[PDB]
Amino acid sequence: TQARAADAADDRPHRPADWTVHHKIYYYVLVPAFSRGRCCTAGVRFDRV
Amino acid sequence: APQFHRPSTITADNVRALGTRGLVLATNNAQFIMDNSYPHPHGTQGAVREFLRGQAAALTDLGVTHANNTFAPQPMFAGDAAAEWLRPSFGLKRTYSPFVV
Amino acid sequence: APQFHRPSTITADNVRALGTRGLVLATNNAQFIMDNSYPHPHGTQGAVREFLRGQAAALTDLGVTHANNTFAPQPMFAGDAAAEWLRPSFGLKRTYSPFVV
């Protein structure tokens, strides 16, 4: 996911500590504030994609 | 040529062989008097069934005269694909402009 | 030419030599009848895998035909530059128009 695929990463990340917290803000809260029940996930056939 | 004041005259070949431009002025220049001593064999309602078999085969002849204007229409709805195992079938929401300069 | 109605024909050399302009038409114009008398050695899931390295490595081919078109790939991010001891490594947001007349 990071900008530097040359300076790759398996153990040491690139993101701040609030980065996933920001996603936990954006996914768990804001999308239900626009959902009113109407949204759902998807599992991806990346071979088809 | 078909006569549109007689019930037992209108066939499928009389409408298809006549052009779509020629179908306009032929029907507009008929006679107001309807004749009733020799009728159409399938009745008065059956002659209207036979008249509509020529106009449906006339746009297919009109599509040939405009085949050098539009393209080949790719499918509109999914479920129609040869390869359904590595990709989906798309479906054209046909918002395009079929036109060949 | 790889036959798209038998999965025992798709290799990476046969698809990369094919352009992506022509792979649009070859998928929709095939035979709908899937055949099952010659299976695939990597499995039928491995035949989809062998198809997509054939498409991905062909993306260099569709790009090299457009090599007189776009610009040099600017370093998008920091850390990609040689001399670091007095000036930094820039990262160029590639929001421009890659086009050379």
Side-chain angles (χ1 to χ4, degrees), chain C residues 51 76 81 88 101:
Chain C
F51 185 78
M76 315 174 196
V101 178

Side-chain angles (χ1 to χ4, degrees), chain B residues 59-73 98-101:
Chain B
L59 295 179
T60 62
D61 293 332
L62 187 63
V64 178
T65 62
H66 291 285
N68 290 318
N69 197 3
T70 64
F71 303 105
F99 185 75
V100 175
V101 176

Side-chain angles (χ1 to χ4, degrees), chain A residues 3-6 8-11 13-49:
Chain A
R4 300 299 301 165
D10 180 76
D11 59 357
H14 291 273
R15 297 298 185 189
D18 299 334
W19 178 253
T20 63
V21 176
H22 278 73
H23 289 80
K24 287 175 71 173
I25 288 171
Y26 180 75
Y27 282 162
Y28 285 91
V29 176
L30 275 75
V31 179
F34 298 108
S35 298
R36 306 293 300 276
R38 290 183 300 276
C39 62
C40 190
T41 59
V44 183
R45 300 286 174 91
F46 280 109
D47 52 358
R48 195 189 298 271
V49 170

